[PDB]
């Protein structure tokens, strides 16, 4: 199990706006996972782990447009780790 | 990044199978299990949603129909619960079907 914080650097790059690179966060990790398929309940049975972010917070920016500035948000993580994949 | 086993799962050591009059047929049975690390991650993105997960398990690459049969019968049982439809395979991959249903 391990779920890590990766920084990133992001180009935007659109037709109009000015050129912006933003730095954020992302979890990327792997977890275990066992599956299988339960013909009692005909479904599967799931009992799994996945790399995310707990905690994040918001990054904005203004992007110079040519016809209008628009406002970017964007999550940034701060905490990774492995927790379920459906909560 | 993914491991295939046959493997005996509480609800089937042994499985019991009931059909009407109270006739009961029990048995063990294998079931085919996926576990493993799949490679996931969570980032955020532009717009609606917000975030963007790459989540996966280690599913079974379902390529056959098992049909097991129990033994352990009580006298005068139905023949359909007799037996068990197993989906059957010999590898598992990491999927998020799991994750959908």
Same mark, same amino acid.
């Given at each position: 199990?391990?779920? /890590? !914080?990766?920084? @990133?650097?992001?180009?935007?790059?659109?037709?109009?706006?000015?050129? +912006?690179?933003?730095?954020?966060?992302? %979890?990327?990790?792997?977890?275990?996972?066992?599956?299988?398929?339960?013909?009692?309940? /005909? !479904?599967?049975? @799931?009992?799994?782990?996945?790399?995310?972010?707990?905690?994040?917070? +918001?990054?904005?920016?203004?992007?110079? %447009?040519?016809?209008?500035?628009?406002?970017?948000?964007?999550?940034?993580?701060?905490?990774?780790?492995?927790?379920?994949?459906?909560? | 990044?993914?491991?295939?086993?046959?493997?005996?799962?509480?609800?089937?050591?042994?499985?019991?199978?009931?059909?009407?009059?109270?006739?009961?047929?029990?048995?063990?049975?294998?079931?085919?299990?996926?576990?493993?690390?799949?490679?996931?991650?969570?980032?955020?993105?532009?717009?609606?949603?917000?975030?963007?997960?790459?989540?996966?398990?280690?599913?079974?690459?379902?390529?056959?129909?098992?049909?097991?049969?129990?033994?352990?019968?009580?006298?005068?049982?139905?023949?359909?619960?007799?037996?068990?439809?197993?989906?059957?395979?010999?590898?598992?991959?990491?999927?998020?079907?799991?994750?959908?249903?």
């Amino acid at each position: 199990n391990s779920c /890590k !914080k990766v920084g @990133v650097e992001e180009l935007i790059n659109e037709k109009g706006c000015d050129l +912006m690179i933003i730095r954020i966060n992302r %979890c990327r990790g792997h977890c275990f996972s066992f599956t299988f398929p339960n013909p009692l309940t /005909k !479904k599967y049975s @799931v009992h799994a782990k996945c790399c995310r972010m707990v905690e994040w917070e +918001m990054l904005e920016t203004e992007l110079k %447009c040519s016809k209008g500035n628009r406002n970017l948000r964007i999550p940034s993580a701060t905490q990774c780790e492995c927790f379920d994949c459906l909560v | 990044e993914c491991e295939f086993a046959m493997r005996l799962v509480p609800g089937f050591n042994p499985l019991r199978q009931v059909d009407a009059n109270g006739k009961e047929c029990r048995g063990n049975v294998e079931l085919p299990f996926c576990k493993g690390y799949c490679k996931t991650s969570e980032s955020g993105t532009h717009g609606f949603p917000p975030r963007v997960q790459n989540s996966k398990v280690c599913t079974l690459v379902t390529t056959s129909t098992r049909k097991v049969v129990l033994d352990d019968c009580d006298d005068g049982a139905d023949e359909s619960v007799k037996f068990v439809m197993v989906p059957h395979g010999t590898d598992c991959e990491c999927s998020a079907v799991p994750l959908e249903q």
